[PDB]
Every structure is written in structure tokens, then in C-alpha cells.
Design an enzyme around this catalytic site. Structure first.
Site, mmCIF file in Angstrom:
data_model
loop_
_atom_site.group_PDB
_atom_site.id
_atom_site.type_symbol
_atom_site.label_atom_id
_atom_site.label_comp_id
_atom_site.label_asym_id
_atom_site.label_seq_id
_atom_site.Cartn_x
_atom_site.Cartn_y
_atom_site.Cartn_z
ATOM 1 N N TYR A 267 -24.021 28.832 80.666
ATOM 2 C CA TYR A 267 -23.388 29.938 81.346
ATOM 3 C C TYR A 267 -23.730 29.920 82.811
ATOM 4 C CZ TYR A 267 -27.913 32.243 81.383
ATOM 5 O OH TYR A 267 -29.262 32.476 81.505
ATOM 6 N N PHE B 81 -26.308 35.420 89.864
ATOM 7 C CA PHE B 81 -27.589 36.003 89.464
ATOM 8 C C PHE B 81 -28.353 35.135 88.469
ATOM 9 C CE2 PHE B 81 -24.485 37.988 86.617
ATOM 10 C CZ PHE B 81 -25.047 37.792 85.384
ATOM 11 N N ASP B 82 -27.714 34.248 87.706
ATOM 12 C CA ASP B 82 -28.418 33.422 86.750
ATOM 13 C C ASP B 82 -27.511 32.332 86.244
ATOM 14 O OD1 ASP B 82 -30.506 32.664 85.005
ATOM 15 O OD2 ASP B 82 -29.809 34.089 83.464
ATOM 16 N N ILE C 222 -26.999 40.580 75.708
ATOM 17 C CA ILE C 222 -26.188 41.743 76.028
ATOM 18 C C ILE C 222 -24.990 41.824 75.077
ATOM 19 C CG2 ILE C 222 -26.890 41.895 78.436
ATOM 20 C CD1 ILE C 222 -24.145 40.614 79.199
ATOM 21 N N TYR D 91 -26.205 45.533 81.326
ATOM 22 C CA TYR D 91 -27.533 46.094 81.591
ATOM 23 C C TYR D 91 -27.500 47.567 81.979
ATOM 24 C CZ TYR D 91 -28.907 41.233 81.236
ATOM 25 O OH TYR D 91 -29.056 39.924 80.784
ATOM 26 N N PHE E 101 -19.182 36.215 83.798
ATOM 27 C CA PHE E 101 -19.754 34.980 83.264
ATOM 28 C C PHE E 101 -18.687 33.919 83.047
ATOM 29 C CE2 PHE E 101 -22.644 38.260 81.723
ATOM 30 C CZ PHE E 101 -23.876 37.703 81.992
#
Length: 128
Positions: free
Chosen positions: A45, A55-56, A75, A101, A118
Site C-alpha cells: 500500500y 503518510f505511510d 482500519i 483514524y 490508499f
């Protein structure tokens, strides 16, 4: 770009139909089956905030991310979204805070009340 295209053209894959998770398929998978709740799923991802900033990514660890589908190990938007995917599929998901979140966020990387984008690839899935 891609997130605005999900906003404007994405399919609402939530049960309530509250636009909490919107999906666009980018690459078809192989085989018609999707994972069952409880299956182990294996994903790559990339995650971006609403201003387009990363962010990631699983690629930060240079390994797929592995979890049991539908156990709340991730999530809500992933338990919903990954269940819709075939092996090898790549999709785009836009995820409202209630399915991500929430008001707590995951600071500093994820702000409060953040809608998340994503790009997810379902590499594999295996039964329990």
C-alpha cells in the site's frame, strides 16, 4: 488527480452507503475469488493525506503488510476494501475518518478527522 477521481467517480462499497469508503479499480486481479473474512491477506500500500502528502507505505519496510481480514487488525476501510479485491488487483480507496483514524488521528503523520487515500495491491490471500 487520483483522489479527486475517487471522490467524483468512486463506488461506495460501504454497507450503510455513507460514502465512507469509495473505490476505483486500477488493475484487475487474476481469478474471480475474493478473500473471505478470516483469511490472511498480504498487501502493498501507499497512503496519502488529503493535501497529497504521503503518510505511510509498506514499501518503507520493504515488505508486504500481512493481516487477518475482518478481525479489526486494521482500519475499517481496509477490512471493507480488501474484502472486495481479487488476487493481483490494485485499487484506489478514499476513506472517511469514521472508517480510518477518526477524531484521534495518528499524530503527527495523520491529522484529526483525516480522509485518507490508499493505493492498495492485494498480493495474495490464504485461508486460516
Amino acid at each position: 488527480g487520483a483522489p479527486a477521481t475517487v471522490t467524483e467517480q468512486g463506488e461506495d462499497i460501504t454497507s450503510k452507503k455513507d460514502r465512507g469508503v469509495l473505490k476505483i479499480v486500477k488493475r484487475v486481479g487474476n481469478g474471480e475469488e475474493t478473500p473471505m473474512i478470516g483469511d490472511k491477506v498480504y498487501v502493498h500500500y501507499k497512503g496519502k493525506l488529503s493535501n497529497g502528502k504521503k503518510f505511510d507505505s509498506s514499501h518503507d519496510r520493504n515488505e508486504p503488510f500481512v493481516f487477518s481480514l475482518g478481525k479489526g487488525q486494521v482500519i475499517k476501510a481496509w477490512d471493507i476494501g480488501v474484502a472486495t479485491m481479487k488476487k493481483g488487483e490494485i485499487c484506489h480507496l478514499l476513506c472517511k475518518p469514521e472508517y480510518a483514524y477518526g477524531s484521534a488521528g495518528s499524530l503527527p503523520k495523520i491529522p484529526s478527522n483525516a480522509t485518507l487515500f490508499f493505493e492498495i495491491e492485494l498480493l495474495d490471500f490464504k485461508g486460516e
